[PDB]
């Protein structure tokens, strides 16, 4: 997250960490919302690669010792059957894991809420991207949990010339796109939190940026719509 600000402890206990294994360490590679007791939700293209993979529930700084954390197994992936790896703007950039133990839910660690089915933000509302992705456009991943206050950018907006024009689909979120904030890699998989009737909920899992660059002027992050994807993960997490 790119002109982000820490986040407080105790703000967003759905956030994970998804790591995967590198030597004798584990490395985060992006973020994603935990939605069950033992499933998780993230984009289809965190785990493209054939890697082996954890998740780190009520994980504040990656680098040092919390008293929170609990650490669990990947034990299925199932990602959208339609996602293709070599077509971002596509969409389906979405996945769901099975967790080899179900986790404690406490301060730390609660499930992340899902919008309703088909619910679309007003254009300018509010919403929190969350992460420990770089805090820079090719910089360096945060060791403490990020928040940027990245409010929506609207279809017909966002889907406009001068922003990301055909790139973006009906099935994604826009928000932001100031040239100050965004998300950035690291981000990816994980929620933008956004404020509907006095709560948050998960309205976006974090896809893509430009080429560009992370924070560019008119070039907004772009999330997978949670809301387009509740039949899905209702069906998979039925027959799984
Ligand atoms: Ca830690």
Known sequence: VVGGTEAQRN???????????????????????????????????????????????????????????????????????????????????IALLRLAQSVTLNSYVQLGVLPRA????????????????????????????????????????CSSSSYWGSTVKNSMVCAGGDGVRSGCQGDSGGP???????????????????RLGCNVTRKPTVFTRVSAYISWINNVIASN
């Open 192 to 210: 933008l939190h956004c404020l509907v009737n006095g709560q948050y909920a998960v309205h976006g899992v974090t896809s893509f940026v430009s």
């Open 118 to 157: 088909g619910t679309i933000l007003a254009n300018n509302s509010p919403c929190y991207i969350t992460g420990w992705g770089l805090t820079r456009t090719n910089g360096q991943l945060a060791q403490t949990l990020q928040q940027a206050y990245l409010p929506t950018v609207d279809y017909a907006i």
């Open 11 to 93: 703000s967003w206990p759905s956030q994970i960490s998804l790591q995967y294994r590198s030597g004798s360490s584990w490395a985060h590679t992006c973020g994603g919302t935990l939605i069950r007791q033992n499933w998780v939700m993230t984009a289809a293209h965190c785990v493209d690669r054939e890697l082996t993979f954890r998740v780190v529930v009520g994980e504040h700084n990656l680098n040092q010792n919390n008293g929170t954390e609990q650490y669990v197994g990947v034990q299925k992936i199932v990602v959208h059957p339609y996602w293709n790896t070599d077509d971002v703007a596509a969409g389906y950039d």
